[PDB]
mmCIF file of N, CA, C and O in Angstrom:
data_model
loop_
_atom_site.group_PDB
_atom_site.id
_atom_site.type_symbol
_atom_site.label_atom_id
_atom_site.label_comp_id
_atom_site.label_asym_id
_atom_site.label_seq_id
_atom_site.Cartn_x
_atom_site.Cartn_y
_atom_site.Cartn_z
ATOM 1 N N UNK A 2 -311.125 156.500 110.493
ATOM 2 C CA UNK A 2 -310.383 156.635 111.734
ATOM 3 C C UNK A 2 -310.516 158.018 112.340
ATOM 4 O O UNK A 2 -309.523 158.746 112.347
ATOM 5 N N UNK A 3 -311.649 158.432 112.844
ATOM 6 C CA UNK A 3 -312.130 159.407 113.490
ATOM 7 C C UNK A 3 -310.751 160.076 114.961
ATOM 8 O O UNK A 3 -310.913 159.892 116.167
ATOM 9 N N UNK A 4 -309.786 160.663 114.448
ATOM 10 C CA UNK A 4 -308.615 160.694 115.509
ATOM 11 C C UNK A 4 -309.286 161.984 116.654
ATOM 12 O O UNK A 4 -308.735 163.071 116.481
ATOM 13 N N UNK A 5 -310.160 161.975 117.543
ATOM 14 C CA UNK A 5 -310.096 162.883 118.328
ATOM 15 C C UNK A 5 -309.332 163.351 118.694
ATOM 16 O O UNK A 5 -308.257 163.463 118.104
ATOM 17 N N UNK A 6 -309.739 164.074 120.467
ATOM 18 C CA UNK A 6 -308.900 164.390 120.808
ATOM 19 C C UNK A 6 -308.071 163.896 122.147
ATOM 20 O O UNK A 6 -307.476 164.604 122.959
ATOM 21 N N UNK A 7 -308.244 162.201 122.124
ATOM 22 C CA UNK A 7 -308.216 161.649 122.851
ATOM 23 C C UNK A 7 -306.180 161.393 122.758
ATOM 24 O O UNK A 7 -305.511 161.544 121.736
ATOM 25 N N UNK A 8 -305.635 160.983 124.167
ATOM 26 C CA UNK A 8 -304.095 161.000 124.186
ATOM 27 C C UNK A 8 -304.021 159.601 123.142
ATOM 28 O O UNK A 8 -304.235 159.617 121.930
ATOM 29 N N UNK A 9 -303.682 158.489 123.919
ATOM 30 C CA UNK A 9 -303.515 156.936 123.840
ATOM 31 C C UNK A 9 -304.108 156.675 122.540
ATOM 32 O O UNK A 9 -305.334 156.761 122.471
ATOM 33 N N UNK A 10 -303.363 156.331 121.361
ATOM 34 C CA UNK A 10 -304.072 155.811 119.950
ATOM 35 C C UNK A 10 -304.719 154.505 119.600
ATOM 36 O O UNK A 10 -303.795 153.720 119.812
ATOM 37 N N UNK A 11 -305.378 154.044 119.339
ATOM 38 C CA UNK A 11 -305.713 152.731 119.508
ATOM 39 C C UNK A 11 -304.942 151.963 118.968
ATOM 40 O O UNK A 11 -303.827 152.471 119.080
ATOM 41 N N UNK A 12 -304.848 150.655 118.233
ATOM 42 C CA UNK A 12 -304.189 149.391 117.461
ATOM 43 C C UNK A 12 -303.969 150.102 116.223
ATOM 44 O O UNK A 12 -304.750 149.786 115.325
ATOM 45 N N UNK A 13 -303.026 151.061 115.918
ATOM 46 C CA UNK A 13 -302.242 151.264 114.576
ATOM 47 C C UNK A 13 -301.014 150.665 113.655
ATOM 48 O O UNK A 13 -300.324 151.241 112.814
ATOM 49 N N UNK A 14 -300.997 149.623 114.007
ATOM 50 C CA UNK A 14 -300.096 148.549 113.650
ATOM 51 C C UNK A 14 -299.173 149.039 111.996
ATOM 52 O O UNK A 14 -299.742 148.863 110.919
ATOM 53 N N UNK A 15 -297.905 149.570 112.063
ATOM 54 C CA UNK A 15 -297.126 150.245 110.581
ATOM 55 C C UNK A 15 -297.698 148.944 109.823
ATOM 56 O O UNK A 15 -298.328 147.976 110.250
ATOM 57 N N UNK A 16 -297.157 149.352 108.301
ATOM 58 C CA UNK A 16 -296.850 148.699 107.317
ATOM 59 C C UNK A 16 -295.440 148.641 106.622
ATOM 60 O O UNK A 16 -294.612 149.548 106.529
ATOM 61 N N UNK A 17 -295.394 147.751 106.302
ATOM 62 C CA UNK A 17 -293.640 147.883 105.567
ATOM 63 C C UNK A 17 -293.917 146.884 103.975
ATOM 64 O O UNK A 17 -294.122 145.759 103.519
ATOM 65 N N UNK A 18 -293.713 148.443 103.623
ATOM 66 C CA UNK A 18 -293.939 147.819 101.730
ATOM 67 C C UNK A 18 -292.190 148.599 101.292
ATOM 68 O O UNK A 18 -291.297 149.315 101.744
ATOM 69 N N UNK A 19 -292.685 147.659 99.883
ATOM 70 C CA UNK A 19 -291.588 147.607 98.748
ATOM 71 C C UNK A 19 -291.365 148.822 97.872
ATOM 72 O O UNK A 19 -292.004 149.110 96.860
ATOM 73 N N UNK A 20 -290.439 149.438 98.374
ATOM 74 C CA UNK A 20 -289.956 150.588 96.375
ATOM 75 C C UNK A 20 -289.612 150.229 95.750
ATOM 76 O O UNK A 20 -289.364 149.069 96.081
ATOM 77 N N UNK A 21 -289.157 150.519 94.257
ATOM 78 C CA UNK A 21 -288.534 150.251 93.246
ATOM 79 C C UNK A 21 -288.720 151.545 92.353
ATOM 80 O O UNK A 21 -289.761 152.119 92.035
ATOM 81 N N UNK A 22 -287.541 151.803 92.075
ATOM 82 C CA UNK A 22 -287.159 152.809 91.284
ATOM 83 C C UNK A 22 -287.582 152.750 89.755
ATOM 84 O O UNK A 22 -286.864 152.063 89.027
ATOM 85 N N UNK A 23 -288.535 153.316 89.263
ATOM 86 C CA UNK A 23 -289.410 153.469 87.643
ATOM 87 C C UNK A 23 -288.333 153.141 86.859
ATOM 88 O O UNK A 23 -287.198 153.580 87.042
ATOM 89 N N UNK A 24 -288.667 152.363 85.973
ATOM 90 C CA UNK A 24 -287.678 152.452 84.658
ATOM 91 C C UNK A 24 -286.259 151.774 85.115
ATOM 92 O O UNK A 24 -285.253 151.861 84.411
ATOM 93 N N UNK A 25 -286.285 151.150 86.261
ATOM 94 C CA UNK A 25 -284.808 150.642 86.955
ATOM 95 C C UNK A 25 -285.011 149.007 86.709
ATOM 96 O O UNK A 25 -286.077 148.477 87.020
ATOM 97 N N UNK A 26 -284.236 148.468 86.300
ATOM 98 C CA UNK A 26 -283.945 147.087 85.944
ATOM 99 C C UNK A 26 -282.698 146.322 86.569
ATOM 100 O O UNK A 26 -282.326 145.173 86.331
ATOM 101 N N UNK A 27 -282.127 147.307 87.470
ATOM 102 C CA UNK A 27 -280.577 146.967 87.629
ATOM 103 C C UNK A 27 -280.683 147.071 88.877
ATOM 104 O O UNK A 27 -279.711 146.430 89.276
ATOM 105 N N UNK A 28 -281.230 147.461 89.779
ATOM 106 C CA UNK A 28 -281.245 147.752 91.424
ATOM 107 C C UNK A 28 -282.963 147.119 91.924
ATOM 108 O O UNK A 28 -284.089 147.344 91.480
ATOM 109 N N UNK A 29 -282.371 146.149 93.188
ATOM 110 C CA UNK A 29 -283.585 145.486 93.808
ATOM 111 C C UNK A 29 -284.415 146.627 94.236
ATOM 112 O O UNK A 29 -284.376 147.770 93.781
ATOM 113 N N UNK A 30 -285.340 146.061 95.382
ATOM 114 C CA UNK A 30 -286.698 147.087 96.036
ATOM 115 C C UNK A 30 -285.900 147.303 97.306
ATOM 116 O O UNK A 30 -284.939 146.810 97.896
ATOM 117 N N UNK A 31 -286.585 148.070 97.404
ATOM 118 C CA UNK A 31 -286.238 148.604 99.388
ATOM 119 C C UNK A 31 -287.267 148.621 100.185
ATOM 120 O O UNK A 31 -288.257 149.286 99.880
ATOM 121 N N UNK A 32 -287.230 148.112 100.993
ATOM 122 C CA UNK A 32 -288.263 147.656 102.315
ATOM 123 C C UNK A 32 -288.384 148.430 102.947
ATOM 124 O O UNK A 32 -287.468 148.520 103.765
ATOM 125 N N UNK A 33 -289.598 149.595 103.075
ATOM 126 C CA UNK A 33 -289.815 150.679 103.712
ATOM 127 C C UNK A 33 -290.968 150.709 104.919
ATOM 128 O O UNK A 33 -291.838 149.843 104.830
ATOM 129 N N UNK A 34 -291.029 151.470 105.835
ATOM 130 C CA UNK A 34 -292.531 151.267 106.473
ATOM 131 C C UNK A 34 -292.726 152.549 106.916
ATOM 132 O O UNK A 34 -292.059 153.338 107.587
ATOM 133 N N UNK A 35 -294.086 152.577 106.241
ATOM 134 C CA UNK A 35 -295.202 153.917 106.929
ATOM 135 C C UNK A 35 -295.880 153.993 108.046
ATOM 136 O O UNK A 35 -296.876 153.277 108.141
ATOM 137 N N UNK A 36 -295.575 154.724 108.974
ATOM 138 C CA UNK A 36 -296.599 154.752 110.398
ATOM 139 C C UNK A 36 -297.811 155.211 109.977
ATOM 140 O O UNK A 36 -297.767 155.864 108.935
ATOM 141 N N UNK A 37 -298.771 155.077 110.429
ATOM 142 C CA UNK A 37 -300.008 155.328 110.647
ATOM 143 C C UNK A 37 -300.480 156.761 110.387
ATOM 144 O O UNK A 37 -301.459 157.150 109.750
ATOM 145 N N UNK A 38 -299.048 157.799 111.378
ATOM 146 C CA UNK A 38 -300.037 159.037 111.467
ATOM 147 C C UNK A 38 -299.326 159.647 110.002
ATOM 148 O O UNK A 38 -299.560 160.839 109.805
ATOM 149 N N UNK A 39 -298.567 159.014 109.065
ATOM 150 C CA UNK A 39 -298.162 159.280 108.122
ATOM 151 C C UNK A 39 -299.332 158.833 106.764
ATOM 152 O O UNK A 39 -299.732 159.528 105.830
ATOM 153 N N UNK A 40 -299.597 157.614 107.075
ATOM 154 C CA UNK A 40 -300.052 156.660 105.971
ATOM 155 C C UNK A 40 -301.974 158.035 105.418
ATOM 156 O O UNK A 40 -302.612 158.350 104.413
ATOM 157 N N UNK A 41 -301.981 158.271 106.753
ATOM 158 C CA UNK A 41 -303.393 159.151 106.080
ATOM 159 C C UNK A 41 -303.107 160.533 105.346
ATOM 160 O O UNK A 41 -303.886 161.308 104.791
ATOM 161 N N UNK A 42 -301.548 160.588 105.554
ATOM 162 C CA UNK A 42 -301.260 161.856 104.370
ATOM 163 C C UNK A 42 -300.227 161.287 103.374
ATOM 164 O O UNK A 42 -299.010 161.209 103.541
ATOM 165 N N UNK A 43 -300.925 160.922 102.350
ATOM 166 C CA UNK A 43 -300.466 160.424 101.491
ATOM 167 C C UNK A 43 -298.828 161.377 101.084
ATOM 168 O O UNK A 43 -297.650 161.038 101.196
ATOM 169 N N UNK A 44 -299.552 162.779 100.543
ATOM 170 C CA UNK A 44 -298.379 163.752 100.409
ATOM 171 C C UNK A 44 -296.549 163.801 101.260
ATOM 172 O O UNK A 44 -295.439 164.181 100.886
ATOM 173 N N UNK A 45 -297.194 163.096 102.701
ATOM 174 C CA UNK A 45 -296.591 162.286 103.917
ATOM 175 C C UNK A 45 -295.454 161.491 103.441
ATOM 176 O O UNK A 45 -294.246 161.662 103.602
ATOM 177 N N UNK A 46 -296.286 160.344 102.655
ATOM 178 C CA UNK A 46 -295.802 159.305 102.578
ATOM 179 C C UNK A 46 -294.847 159.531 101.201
ATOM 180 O O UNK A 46 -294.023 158.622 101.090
ATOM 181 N N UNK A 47 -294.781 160.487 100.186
ATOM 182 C CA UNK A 47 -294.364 160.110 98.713
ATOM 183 C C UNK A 47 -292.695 161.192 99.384
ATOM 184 O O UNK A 47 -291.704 161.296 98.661
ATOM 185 N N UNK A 48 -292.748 161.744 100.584
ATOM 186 C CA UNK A 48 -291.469 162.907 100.867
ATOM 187 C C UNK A 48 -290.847 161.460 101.544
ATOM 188 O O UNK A 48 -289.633 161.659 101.541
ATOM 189 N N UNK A 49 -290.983 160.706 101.864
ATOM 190 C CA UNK A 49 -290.237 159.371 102.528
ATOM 191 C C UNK A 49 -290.006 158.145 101.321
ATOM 192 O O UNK A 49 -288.943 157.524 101.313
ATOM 193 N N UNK A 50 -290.769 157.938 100.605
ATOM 194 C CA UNK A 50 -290.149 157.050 99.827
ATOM 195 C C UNK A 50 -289.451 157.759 98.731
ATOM 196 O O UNK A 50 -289.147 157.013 97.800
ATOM 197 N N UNK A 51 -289.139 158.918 98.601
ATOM 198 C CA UNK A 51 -288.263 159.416 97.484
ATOM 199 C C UNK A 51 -286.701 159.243 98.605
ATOM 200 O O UNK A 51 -285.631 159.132 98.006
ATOM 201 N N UNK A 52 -286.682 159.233 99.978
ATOM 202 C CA UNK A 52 -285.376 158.901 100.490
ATOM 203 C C UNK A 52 -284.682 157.289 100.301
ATOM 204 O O UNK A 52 -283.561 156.811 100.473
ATOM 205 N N UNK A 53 -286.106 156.729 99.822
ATOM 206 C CA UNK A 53 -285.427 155.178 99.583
ATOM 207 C C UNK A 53 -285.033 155.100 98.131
ATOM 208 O O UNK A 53 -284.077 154.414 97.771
ATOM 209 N N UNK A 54 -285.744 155.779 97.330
ATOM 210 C CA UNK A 54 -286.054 156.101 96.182
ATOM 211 C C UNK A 54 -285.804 156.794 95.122
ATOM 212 O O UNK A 54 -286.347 156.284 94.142
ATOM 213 N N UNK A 55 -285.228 157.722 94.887
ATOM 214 C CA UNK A 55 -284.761 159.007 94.466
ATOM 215 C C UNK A 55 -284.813 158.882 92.779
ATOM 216 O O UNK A 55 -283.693 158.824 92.272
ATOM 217 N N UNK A 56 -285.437 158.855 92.265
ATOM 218 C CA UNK A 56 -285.749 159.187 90.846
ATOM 219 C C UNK A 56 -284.801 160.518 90.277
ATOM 220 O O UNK A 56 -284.845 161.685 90.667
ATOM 221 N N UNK A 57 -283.954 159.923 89.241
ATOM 222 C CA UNK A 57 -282.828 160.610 88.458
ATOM 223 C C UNK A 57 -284.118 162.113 87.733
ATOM 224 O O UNK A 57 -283.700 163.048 87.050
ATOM 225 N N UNK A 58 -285.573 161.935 88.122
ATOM 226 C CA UNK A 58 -286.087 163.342 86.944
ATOM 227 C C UNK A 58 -286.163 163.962 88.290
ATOM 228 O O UNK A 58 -286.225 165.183 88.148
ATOM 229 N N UNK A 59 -286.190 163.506 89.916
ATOM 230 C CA UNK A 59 -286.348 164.084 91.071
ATOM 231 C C UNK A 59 -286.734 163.475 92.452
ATOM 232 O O UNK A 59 -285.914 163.233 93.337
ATOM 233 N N UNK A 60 -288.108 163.250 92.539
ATOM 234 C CA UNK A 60 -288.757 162.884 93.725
ATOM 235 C C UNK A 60 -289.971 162.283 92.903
ATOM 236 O O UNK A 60 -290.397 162.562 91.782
ATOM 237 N N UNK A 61 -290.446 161.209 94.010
ATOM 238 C CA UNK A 61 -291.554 160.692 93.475
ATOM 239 C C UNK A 61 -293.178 161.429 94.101
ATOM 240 O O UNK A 61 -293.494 161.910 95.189
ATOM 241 N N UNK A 62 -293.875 161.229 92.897
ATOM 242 C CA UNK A 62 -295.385 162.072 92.992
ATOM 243 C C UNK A 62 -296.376 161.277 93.263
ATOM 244 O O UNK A 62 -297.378 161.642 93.877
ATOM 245 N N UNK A 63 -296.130 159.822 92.716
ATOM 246 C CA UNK A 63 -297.020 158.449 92.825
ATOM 247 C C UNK A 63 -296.569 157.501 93.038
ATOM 248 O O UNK A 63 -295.341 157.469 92.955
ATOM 249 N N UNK A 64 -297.279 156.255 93.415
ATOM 250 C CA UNK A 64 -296.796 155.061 93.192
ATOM 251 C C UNK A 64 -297.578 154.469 92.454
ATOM 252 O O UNK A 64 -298.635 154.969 92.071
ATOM 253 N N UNK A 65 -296.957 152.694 91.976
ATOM 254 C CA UNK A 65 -297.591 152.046 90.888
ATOM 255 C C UNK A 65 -297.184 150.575 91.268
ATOM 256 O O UNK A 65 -296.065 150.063 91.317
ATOM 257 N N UNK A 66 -298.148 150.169 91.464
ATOM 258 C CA UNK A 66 -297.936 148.004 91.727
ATOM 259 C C UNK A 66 -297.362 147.520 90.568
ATOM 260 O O UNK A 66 -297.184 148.242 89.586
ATOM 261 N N UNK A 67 -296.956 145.961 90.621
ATOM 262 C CA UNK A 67 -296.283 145.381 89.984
ATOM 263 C C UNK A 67 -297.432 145.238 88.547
ATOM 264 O O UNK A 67 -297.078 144.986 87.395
ATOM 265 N N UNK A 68 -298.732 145.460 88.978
ATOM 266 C CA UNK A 68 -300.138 145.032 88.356
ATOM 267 C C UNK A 68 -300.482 145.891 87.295
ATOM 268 O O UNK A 68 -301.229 145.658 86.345
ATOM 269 N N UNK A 69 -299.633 147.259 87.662
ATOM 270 C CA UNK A 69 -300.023 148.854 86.469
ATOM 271 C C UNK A 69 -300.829 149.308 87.427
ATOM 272 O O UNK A 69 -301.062 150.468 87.090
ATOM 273 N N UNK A 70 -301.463 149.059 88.542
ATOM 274 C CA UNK A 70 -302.222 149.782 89.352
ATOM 275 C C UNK A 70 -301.893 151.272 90.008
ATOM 276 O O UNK A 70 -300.719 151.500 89.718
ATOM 277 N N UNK A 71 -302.466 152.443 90.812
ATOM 278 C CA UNK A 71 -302.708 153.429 90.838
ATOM 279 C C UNK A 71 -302.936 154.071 92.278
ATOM 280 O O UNK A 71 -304.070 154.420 92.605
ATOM 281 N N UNK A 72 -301.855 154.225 93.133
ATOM 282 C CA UNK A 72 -301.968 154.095 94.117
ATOM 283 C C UNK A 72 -301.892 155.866 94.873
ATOM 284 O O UNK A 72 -300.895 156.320 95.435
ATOM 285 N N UNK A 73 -302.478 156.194 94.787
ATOM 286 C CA UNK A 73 -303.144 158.072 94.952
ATOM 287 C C UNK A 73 -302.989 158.088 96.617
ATOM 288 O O UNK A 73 -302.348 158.998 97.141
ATOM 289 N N UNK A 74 -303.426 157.344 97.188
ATOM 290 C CA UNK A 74 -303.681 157.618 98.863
ATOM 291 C C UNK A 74 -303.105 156.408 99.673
ATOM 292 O O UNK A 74 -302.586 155.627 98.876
ATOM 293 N N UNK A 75 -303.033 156.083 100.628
ATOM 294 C CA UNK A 75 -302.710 155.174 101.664
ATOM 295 C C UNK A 75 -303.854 154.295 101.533
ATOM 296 O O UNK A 75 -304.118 153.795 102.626
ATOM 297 N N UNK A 76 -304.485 153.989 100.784
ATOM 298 C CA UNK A 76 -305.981 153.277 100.356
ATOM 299 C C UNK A 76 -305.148 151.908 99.898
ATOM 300 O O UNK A 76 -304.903 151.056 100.753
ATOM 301 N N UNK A 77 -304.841 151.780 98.900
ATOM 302 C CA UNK A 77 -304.432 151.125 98.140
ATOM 303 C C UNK A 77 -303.113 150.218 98.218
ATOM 304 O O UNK A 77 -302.863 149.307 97.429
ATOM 305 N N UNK A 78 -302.266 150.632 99.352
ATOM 306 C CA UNK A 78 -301.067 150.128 100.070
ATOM 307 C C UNK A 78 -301.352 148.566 100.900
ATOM 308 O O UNK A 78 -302.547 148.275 100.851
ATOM 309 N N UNK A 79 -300.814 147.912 101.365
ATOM 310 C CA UNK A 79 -300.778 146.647 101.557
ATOM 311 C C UNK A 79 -299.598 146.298 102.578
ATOM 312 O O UNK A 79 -298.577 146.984 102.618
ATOM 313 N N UNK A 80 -299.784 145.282 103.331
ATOM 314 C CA UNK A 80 -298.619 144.347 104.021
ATOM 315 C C UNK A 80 -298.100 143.783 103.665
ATOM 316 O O UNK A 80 -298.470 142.610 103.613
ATOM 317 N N UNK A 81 -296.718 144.201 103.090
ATOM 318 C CA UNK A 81 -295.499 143.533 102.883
ATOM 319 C C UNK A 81 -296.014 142.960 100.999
ATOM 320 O O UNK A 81 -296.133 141.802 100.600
ATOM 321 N N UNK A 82 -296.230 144.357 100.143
ATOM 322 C CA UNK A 82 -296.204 144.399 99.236
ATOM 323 C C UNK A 82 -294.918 144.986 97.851
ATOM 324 O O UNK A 82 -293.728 145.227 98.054
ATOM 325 N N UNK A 83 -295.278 145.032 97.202
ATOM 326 C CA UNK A 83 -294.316 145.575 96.014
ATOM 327 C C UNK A 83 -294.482 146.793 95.369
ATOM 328 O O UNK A 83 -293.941 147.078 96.437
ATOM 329 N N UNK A 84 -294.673 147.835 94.711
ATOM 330 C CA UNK A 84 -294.865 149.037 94.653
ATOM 331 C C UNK A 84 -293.737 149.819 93.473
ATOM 332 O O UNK A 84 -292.699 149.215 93.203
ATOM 333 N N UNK A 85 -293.883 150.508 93.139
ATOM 334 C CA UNK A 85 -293.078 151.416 92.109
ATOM 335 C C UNK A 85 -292.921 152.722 92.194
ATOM 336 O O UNK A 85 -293.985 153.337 92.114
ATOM 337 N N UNK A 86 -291.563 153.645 92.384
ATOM 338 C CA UNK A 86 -291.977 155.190 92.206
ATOM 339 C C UNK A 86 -292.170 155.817 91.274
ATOM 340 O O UNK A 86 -291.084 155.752 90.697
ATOM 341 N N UNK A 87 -292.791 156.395 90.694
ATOM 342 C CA UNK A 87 -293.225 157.322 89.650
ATOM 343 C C UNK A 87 -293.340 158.823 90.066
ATOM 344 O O UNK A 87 -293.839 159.147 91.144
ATOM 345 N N UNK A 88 -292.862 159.709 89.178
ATOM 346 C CA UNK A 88 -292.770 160.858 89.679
ATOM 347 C C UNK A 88 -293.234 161.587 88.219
ATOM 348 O O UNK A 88 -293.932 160.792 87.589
ATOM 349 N N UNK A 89 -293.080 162.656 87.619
ATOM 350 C CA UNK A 89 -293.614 163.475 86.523
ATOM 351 C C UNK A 89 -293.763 162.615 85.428
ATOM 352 O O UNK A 89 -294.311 163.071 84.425
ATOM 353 N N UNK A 90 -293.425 161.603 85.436
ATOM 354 C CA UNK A 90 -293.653 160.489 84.186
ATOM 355 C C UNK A 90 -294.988 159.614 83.524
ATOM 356 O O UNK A 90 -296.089 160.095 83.793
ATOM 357 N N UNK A 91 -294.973 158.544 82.800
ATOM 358 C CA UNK A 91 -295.546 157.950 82.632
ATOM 359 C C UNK A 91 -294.902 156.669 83.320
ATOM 360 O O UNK A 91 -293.693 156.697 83.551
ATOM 361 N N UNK A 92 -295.917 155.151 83.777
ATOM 362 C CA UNK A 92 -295.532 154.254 84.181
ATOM 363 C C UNK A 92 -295.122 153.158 83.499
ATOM 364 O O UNK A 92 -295.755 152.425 82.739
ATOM 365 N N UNK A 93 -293.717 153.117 83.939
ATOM 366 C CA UNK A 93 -293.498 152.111 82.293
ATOM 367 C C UNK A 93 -293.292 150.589 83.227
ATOM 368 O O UNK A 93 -292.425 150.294 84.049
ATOM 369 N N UNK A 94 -294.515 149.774 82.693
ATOM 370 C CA UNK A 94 -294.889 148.979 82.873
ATOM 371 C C UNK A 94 -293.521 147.872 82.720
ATOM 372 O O UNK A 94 -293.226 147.178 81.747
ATOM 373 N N UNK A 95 -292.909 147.978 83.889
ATOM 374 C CA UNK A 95 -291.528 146.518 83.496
ATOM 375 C C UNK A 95 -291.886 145.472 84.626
ATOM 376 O O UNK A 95 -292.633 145.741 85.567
ATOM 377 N N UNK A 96 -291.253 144.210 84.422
ATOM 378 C CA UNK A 96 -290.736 143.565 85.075
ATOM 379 C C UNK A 96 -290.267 143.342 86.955
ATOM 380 O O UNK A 96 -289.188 142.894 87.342
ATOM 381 N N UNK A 97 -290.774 143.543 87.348
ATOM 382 C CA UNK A 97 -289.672 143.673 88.613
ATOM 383 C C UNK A 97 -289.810 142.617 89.678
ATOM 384 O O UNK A 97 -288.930 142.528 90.534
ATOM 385 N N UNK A 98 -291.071 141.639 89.693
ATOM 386 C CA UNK A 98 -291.216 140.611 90.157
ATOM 387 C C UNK A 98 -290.129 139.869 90.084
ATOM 388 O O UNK A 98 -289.952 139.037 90.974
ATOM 389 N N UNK A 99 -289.154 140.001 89.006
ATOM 390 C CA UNK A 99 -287.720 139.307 89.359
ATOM 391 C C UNK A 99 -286.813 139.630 89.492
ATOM 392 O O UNK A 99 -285.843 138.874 89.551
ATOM 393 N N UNK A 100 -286.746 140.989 89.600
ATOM 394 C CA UNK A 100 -285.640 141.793 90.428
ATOM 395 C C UNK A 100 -285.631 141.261 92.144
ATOM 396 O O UNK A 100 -284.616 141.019 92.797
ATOM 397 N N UNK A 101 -287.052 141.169 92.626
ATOM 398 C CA UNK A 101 -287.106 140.483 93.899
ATOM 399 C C UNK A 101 -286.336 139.460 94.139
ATOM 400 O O UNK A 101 -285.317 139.710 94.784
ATOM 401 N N UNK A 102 -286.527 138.312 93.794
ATOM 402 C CA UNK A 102 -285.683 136.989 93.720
ATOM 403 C C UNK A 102 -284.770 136.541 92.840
ATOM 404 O O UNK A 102 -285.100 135.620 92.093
ATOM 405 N N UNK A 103 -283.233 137.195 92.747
ATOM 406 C CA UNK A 103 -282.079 137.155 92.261
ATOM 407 C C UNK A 103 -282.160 135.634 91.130
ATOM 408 O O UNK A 103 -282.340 134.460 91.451
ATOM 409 N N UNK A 104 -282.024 136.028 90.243
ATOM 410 C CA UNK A 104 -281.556 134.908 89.439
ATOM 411 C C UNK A 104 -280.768 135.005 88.180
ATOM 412 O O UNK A 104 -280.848 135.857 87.295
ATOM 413 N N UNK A 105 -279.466 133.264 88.335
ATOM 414 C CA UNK A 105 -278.983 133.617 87.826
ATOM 415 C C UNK A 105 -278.706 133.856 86.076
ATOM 416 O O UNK A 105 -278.895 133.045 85.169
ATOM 417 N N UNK A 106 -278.256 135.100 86.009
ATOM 418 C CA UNK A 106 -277.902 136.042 84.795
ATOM 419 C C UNK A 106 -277.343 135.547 83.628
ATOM 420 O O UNK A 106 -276.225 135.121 83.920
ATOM 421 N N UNK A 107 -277.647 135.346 82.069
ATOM 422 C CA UNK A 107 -277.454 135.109 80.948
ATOM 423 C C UNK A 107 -276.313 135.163 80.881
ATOM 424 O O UNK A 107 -275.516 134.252 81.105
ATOM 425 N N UNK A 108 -275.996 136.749 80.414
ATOM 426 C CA UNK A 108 -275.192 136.998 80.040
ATOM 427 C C UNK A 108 -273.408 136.941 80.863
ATOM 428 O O UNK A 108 -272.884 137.795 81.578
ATOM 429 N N UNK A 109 -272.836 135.555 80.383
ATOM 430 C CA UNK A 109 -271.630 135.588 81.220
ATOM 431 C C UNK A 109 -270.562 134.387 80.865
ATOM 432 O O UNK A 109 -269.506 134.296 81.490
#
């Protein structure tokens, strides 16, 4: 996306993906969306999802799919996907595909 120095931007259409807080089992995702002139600075994008997000070691540094995947840049992001914050940690590979769709609970 060669941005000259032209006014009028062409068809930059946002995205609105999913957080979920690392290591969280108890709180759903949050439905966030990145504009465009954000999404090509990744660095951009990780100071906005730590406001949906907020990781008890701080702020998040990365993200991580439901898959264990590795998401470094605005490359790897998607429409109306699922996602994980990770911040100085390791990714601990849980569950959260059913944190999405409430169901009901064992223990009761």
């Amino acid at each position: 996306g060669s941005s000259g120095s032209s006014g009028r931007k062409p068809l930059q259409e946002p995205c609105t993906i999913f957080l979920i807080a690392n290591g969280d089992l108890i709180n759903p995702a949050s439905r966030l969306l990145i504009p465009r002139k954000t999404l090509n600075q990744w660095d951009h994008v990780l100071q906005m999802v730590t406001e949906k997000i907020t990781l008890r070691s701080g702020a998040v540094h990365r993200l991580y799919t439901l898959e264990g995947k590795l998401v470094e840049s605005g490359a790897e992001l998607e429409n109306g996907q699922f996602y994980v914050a990770v911040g100085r940690d390791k990714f601990k590979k849980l569950p959260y595909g059913e944190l999405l769709f409430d169901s009901g609970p064992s223990s009761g």
